[PDB]
Amino acid sequence: IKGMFNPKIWDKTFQDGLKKEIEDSQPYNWGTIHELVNDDLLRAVRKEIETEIHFTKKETDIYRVNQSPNLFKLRQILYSKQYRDFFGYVTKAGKLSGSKTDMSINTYTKGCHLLTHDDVIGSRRISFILYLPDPDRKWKSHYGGGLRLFPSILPNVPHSDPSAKLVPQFNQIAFFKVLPGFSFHDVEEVKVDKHRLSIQGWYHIPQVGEEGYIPGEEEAWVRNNTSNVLEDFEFPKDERNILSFHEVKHFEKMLKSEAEFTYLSQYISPEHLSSKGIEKLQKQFVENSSLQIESFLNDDKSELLKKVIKQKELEQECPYHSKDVKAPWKTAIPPHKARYLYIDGKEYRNFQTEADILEALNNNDLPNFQFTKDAIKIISSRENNFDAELALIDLAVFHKSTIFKKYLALLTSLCPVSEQILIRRFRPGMDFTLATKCRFNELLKSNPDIIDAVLEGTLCLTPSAGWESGELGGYELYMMDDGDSVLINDPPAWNTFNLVLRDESVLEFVKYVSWSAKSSRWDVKMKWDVKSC
Amino acid sequence: IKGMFNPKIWDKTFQDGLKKEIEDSQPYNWGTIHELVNDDLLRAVRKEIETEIHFTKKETDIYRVNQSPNLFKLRQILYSKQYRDFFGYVTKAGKLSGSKTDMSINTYTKGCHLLTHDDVIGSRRISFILYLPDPDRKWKSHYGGGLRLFPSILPNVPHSDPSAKLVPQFNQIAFFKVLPGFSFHDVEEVKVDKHRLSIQGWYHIPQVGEEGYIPGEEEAWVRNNTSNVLEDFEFPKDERNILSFHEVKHFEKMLKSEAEFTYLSQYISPEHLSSKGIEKLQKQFVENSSLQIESFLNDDKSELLKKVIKQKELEQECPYHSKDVKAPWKTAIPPHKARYLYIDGKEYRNFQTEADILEALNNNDLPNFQFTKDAIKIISSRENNFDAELALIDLAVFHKSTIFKKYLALLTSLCPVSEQILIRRFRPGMDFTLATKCRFNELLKSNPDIIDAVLEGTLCLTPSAGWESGELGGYELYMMDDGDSVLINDPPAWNTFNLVLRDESVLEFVKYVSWSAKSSRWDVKMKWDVKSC
Ligand SMILES: [Fe+2]
Ligand SMILES: [Fe+2]
């Protein structure tokens, strides 16, 4: 007497064709029904929400999305046994509690986005989401908002690029047995000004005294989810190369030059080489444990970079699939921890297969921006593709100079003992990172002299405008954990230098750059391990 | 009444021309008189030695040389005031004790050699050496044995190549005010079968109650000589790059593969990949803390290398001046600590001037044999110059593979946490190293897990014959200090692999390769820091 869905969902020859679609489905097992419910019932339950429900915008590292009568009816007929049975059949999940229900209504409006994840929380068995776009008009693909599925190139290593994506329509449902490590999906940012209404939900383990219930099963699942060995599949790695004994020795000695100050002055702005610049820079750090230099690079370099970068954004075509990223550039992986372009001093890697990865793990090389610089320059119009790189690689060498670190030690009265340097490019479509702590060196933590902190520096070279604030994304965020505690929320800017000294409690990330960004965010990141001087 | 020298040495217009030669002399202040003594007196004092004195061969890292009536007369007339006065005048040393005398007779016979040093021990003021070759025949330049002076490119940083060299004759004397840090000289190996007799000596500070004596002066000199900051001018450096967290993590895990064993088998010989090979290799190390694998590399590689190397020795022309060393090769400096060719993963450096050095210190890059490999291969007959390199660089990458270190960890039940790899070439004319200990990491020694030892490995790929024993040099020596204790004295061989685990007490060096060697000694050296597993 609840057969008020699409009559066909009850026709067994449709049901059977459906279990065999889900079976053949790629990259993991998922399915979609095109007009799930009685058209009249949706229009009603949409109309209702539209006039009764308040949706407020929320933003974290992983998403931006606006959250929160006969809607009740829809909730009953979905957790109805007539439907649960059918669902757990075509989907091959077996039994699923109609007692423990959970749904959520959300609108995705322009700029709203959920990026990659596997939906695997606690007790969820099957995940589904019915869509509620405008019934009267067709939802075009280019509007965005599509649901995207990720091929896994290793259990718990989703490929950076999605391989499936459906443009959902009004009465459409998408769902999938939640298979841990594989069911990676996200929702493509909404690139147009509209409000895509949606009802997400989840069926769960059958509960105590419920049809299909097995004792201890529920916990044999969630307690199962606890390992970190996946660390090895993070590129780039969060580990710092140690400094030559002479670099560190030299620094200590200083804290117990006419040629040095001229070296420094050919990259950094006179304002910060001056005694009173340095003096102020010293004052600020001592108190804030950070410093936020404006117009850091001197004009000659600031000009050149801006020129080659603004020129690469315009005359050039940014690769948007990982397979398309060409040397010197690598793409950061996996997509459920981050996704951005970058050049480190290392040998070229394009991870498409498990073997590509394993290769790089066995043949692990050390960073060398000089060799890299040489190699690019030997090649040589697409060459503007390298104009920006050469410019930026020169910039990399400079911050790898023992003189620069001397300058750095001076500002901070801290001695650099290690170094990592990465020049990164976040593209409006795709790039971002998520809130994470820093990875102190395991070899060093067994040592007093090196304090439990990482000196993190970021030199933004983002040329374009409108990064305020910060509905365009790309902003860098630091903050504590355990109500908000954001310590820095710096939108992308041109020619700024940020220095934080992070302990464990501080989490950082640069927010997904929105598709509507006028350019990619460029910057040079640099971490150092640090001793007391 | 001792005017039985060359009458002219007493003529003041010769004396004055002499102080102005020593003044203009390069690279530091030194002089030579062509027929110092009464010809009859030398012939007598030579004849005497020839028939009364026993000379026995002695050998250390720095030299090979045979050591040990009217000779007494020569000793009196040299420490005579008539002469001391004149000497300390033309030389500008002031007063010099005729009380505290010291001389030494030595013959240099074929293969005998003293390499670079500054003669600066204790109280010596001026250093001299009168020669006693065959009076009747002329000592030709190509016989070798010449005295050679080194330009200093920094106080206590002698240039690798000598800039002066005189072929001494019978009645010739060479001498120089001993100026610490600059007076670097050596004697070119004697390349011919003859016995060059010589009387070395030294004038000292004036002593207590002696003409020209100042109290506390003597000790204000020797106690002056005590600093280590010169470490920074050693290339290559004796410091190890740390391993990625995954490499070490992986090793621990193993000590708490069908694809690995096929990887290993494409460089190393089946004999040592077999379970019983491995088993024996394990037994040996556990007891000897070392192992000396014979025919290590498999035949296909052993053959290829031998081919390209034997081919580079023949068809090619080895650079013999540092300025001539071309990429990929660097020369090790300074010459009073070592001198040999080598390729490390690093960017090309040719140190001729103080600025060349400083450049490299400021722009310190990390090793990368892959980039290096690429760069060589892009270039391309002189190209055999690279045939051997490509062959050897491939060999380098293999020992930098996380798989190989896994294999290494297995033999030793030790975990590699760091790595340095150098492929080196010792040339018959010039190359060698001296007895030194290992340089434990200063950052790590503050840590229990890493034991106080370095795992040192050497893969000799010396093709030629006659390295026995070991009058040709090039042998690798380990030993303790504080009577002989040599722990290993392995002449150069083809395709051997040596593994020692050195603590502090063990000193190593590869002996000066003699000019008469049939080829250069080639090898791949590799050091690792090590944790307990
Ligand atoms: Fe989801
Ligand atoms: Fe000497």
Q: Are residue B210 and residue B241 in the same domain, yes or no?
A: no
Asked if B368 and A366 come within 8 Å (Cβ–Cβ), the reply is yes
Do B298 and B265 contact (CB within 8 A), yes or no?
A: yes
Last residue within a domain, chosen from B226, B250, B272: B226
Query: Which residue in A246, A364, A378 is closest to B244 by CB distance?
Result: A364
Rg over alpha carbons for chain B, rounded to the nearest Å, is: 26
Where among B165, B199, B226 does a domain terminate?
Answer: B226
Same domain assignment for residues A148 and A294: no
Same domain, B144 and B192: yes
**What residue has token string 């300058």?**
A407
From chain B, the residues in CB contact with A258 under 8 A are none
Ligand minimally distant from the alpha carbon of residue A147: 1
d(CA B410, CA B250) in angstroms, rounded, equals 12
The ligand that comes nearest to the alpha carbon of residue B175 is: 2
- Judged by a CB distance cut-off of 8 A, whether residue B377 touches chain A is no
For the record, the structure tokens of B489 come out as: 């004295």
Per DSSP, A420 falls in state E
Ligand that comes closest to the CA of residue B183: 2
- Measured in Å, residue B18 CA sits from the centre of ligand 2 at 21
Contact A226/A220 with Cβ under 8 angstroms?
Answer: no
CATH number, domain containing residue A182: 2.60.120.620
Residues B303 and B381 in one domain: yes
Q: Does A347 touch chain B (CB under 8 A)?
A: yes
- Give A-chain residues touching B228 at CB under 8 angstroms: none
Q: Do A244 and B237 touch (CB under 8 A)?
A: yes
Strand partners, B132: B197
Contact B245 A237 (CB under 8 A): yes
CA distance A129 to A202: 8
Tokens of A267: 């990259």
Do A205 and A240 belong together in one domain?
A: no
Q: Which chain B residues are closer than 8 Å to A367 by Cβ?
A: 366
- DSSP 8-state code for residue B323: G
Residue A309 and residue A174 share a domain = no
Domain end (from B182, B201, B226): B226
Distance from CA of A347 to the nearest CA of B (A): 7
Q: Which among B370, B417, B447 has CB closest to A365?
A: B370
To the nearest whole Å, the CA of A241 is away from the closest chain B CA by 7
Other beta carbons within 10 Å of A212? 15
Residue (of A80, A68, A82, A73) closest to A45 by Cα position: A73
Same domain, B208 and B284: no
Residue B402 has its nearest CB partner, among A345, A364, A366, at: A364
Q: Pick the residue of A239, A246, A252 with the most B CBs within 10 A to test the interface with B by mutation.
A: A246
Contact pairs from chain A to chain B, CB under 8 Å: 116
Alpha helices in A140-274 (DSSP H): 219-222, 245-254, 258-264, 270-273
Residues B39 and B17 sit within 8 Å (Cβ to Cβ):
no
Closest residue in A to B358 (Cα) is: A402
Do A258 and A367 sit in the same domain of this protein? yes
Q: Which of B292, B247, B294 is nearest to B407 (CA)?
A: B247
What distance in Å separates the CA atoms of residue B533 and residue A444, rounded to the nearest whole number?
Answer: 19
Q: Do A244 and B263 touch (CB under 8 A)?
A: no
Question: Are both B392 and B528 inside the same structural domain?
Answer: yes
Residue type at B153 in one-letter notation: I
Q: Which residue of B242, B375, B400 is in closest CB contact with A374? A: B375
How many of the other CB atoms lie within 10 Å of CB of A40? 10
Among candidates B251, B278, B528, B270, which has minimal Cα distance to B411? B278
* Broken C–N links (> 2.5 Å) in chain A, after residues: 68, 226, 256, 380, 482
Number of H helices, E strands in chain A: 14, 25
| Distance from C-alpha of B126 to C-alpha of B96, rounded to nearest angstrom | 8
Q: In chain B, whose CA is at the least distance from the CA of A447?
A: B446
Question: In the block, which residue shows the tokens 């040709």?
Answer: B472
B42 C-alpha vs ligand 2 centroid, how far in Å? Answer: 21
CATH of the domain at B282: 3.60.130.20
Residues 6+ apart with CB under 8 A from B274: none
- What tokens were used for B110? 């074929």
Q: Which residues surround ligand 2, an ion (CB under 5 A)?
A: B 119
Chain B residues whose CB is inside 8 A of the A401 CB are 362-363
The Å distance, Cα B117 to ligand 2 centre, comes to: 7
CB distance A443 to A526 below 8 Å: no
B136 touches chain A (CB under 8 A): no
Same domain as A252, residue A208:
no
d(CA B498, CA B456): 8
- B110 CB contacts (<8 Å, ≥6 apart)? B190, B191, B192, B193, B194, B516
Do the chains contact at A402 and B443, CB–CB below 8 Å?
no
- Secondary structure element (H or E) that encloses residue B264, with its range: helix B258-264
* B151: preceding bond cis by omega (within 30 degrees): no
Rg of chain A (C-alpha set): 26
Binding residues of B: 117, 119, 131, 185, 196
CB atoms within 10 A of CB B185: 25
The range of the structural domain enclosing residue A16 comes to 1-226
Q: HSE (CB half, 13 Å, CA atoms) of B89?
A: 14
How far from A301 is each of A221, A268, A270, A525, A526, CA to CA, in Å? 56, 8, 12, 17, 19
Chain B environment of A399 (Cβ under 8 Å): none
Give the 3-state secondary structure of B431-484: CEECCECCCCCCCCCCCCCEEEEEEEEEEEECCCCCCCCCCCCCCEEEEECCCC
The residues in A 188-247 lying below 8 A from B, measured between CB atoms, are 231-232, 237, 239, 241-242, 244-247
Q: Identify which of A245, A368, A443 has the shortest CB distance to residue B239.
A: A245
Contact B365 A361 (CB under 8 A): no
Number of domains in chain A: 2
Contact list in B for residue A245 (CB cut-off 8 A) is: 231, 237, 239, 442
Which of B357, B366, B376 to mutate to test binding with chain A, by most A CBs within 10 Å of its CB? B366
Residues A323, A291 share a domain: yes
Instruction: Please name the member of B374, B401, B444 whose beta carbon is closest to the beta carbon of A443.
Output: B444
Closest ligand to residue B120's CA: 2
> Which of helix, strand or coil describes residue B189?
coil
Cβ-contact B410, B254 below 8 angstroms: yes
Q: Which residue of B has its CA nearest to A236?
A: B244
Whether chain A has a CB inside 8 Å of the CB on B361: the answer is yes
Sheet holding A506-510, edge to edge: A486-490, A476-480, A506-510
Asked if A241's CB is within 8 angstroms of B241's CB, the reply is: yes
**Shortest Cα distance, chain A CAs vs residue B523, angstroms:** 22
The experimental technique behind this entry is X-ray
- The closest of B2, B14, B6 to B79, measured between CA atoms, is B2
Shortest distance, CA B158 to any CA of chain A (angstroms): 20
Ligand with smallest separation from the Cα of B118 = 2
A319 with A232, same domain?
yes
Q: How far is B169 from chain A (nearest CA, A)?
A: 46
Nearest neighbour of B239 by CB, restricted to A244, A345, A365 = A244
Q: Tell me the pairing of strands B147-150 and B184-187.
A: antiparallel
Instruction: Please report which ligand is nearest the Cα atom of A336.
Output: 1
Of A293, A289, A290, the closest CA to residue A274 belongs to: A293
**Inter-chain contact B446–A443, Cβ cutoff 8 Å?**
no
Q: B51: which DSSP letter?
A: H
Among B426, B432, B427, B408, smallest CA distance to B418 is for: B408
**Which residues in chain B have Cβ-Cβ distances shorter than 8 Å to A364?**
244, 246-247, 400, 402
Structure tokens at A46: 């949409």
Tell whether the torsion through CA atoms of A131, A133, A137 and A142 is positive or negative: negative
Pick B242's closest partner by Cβ from A237, A263, A443: A443
Q: Residue A444 is nearest to which of B365, B367, B443, comparing CB atoms?
A: B443
Report d(CA A304, CA A320) in Å as an integer.
26
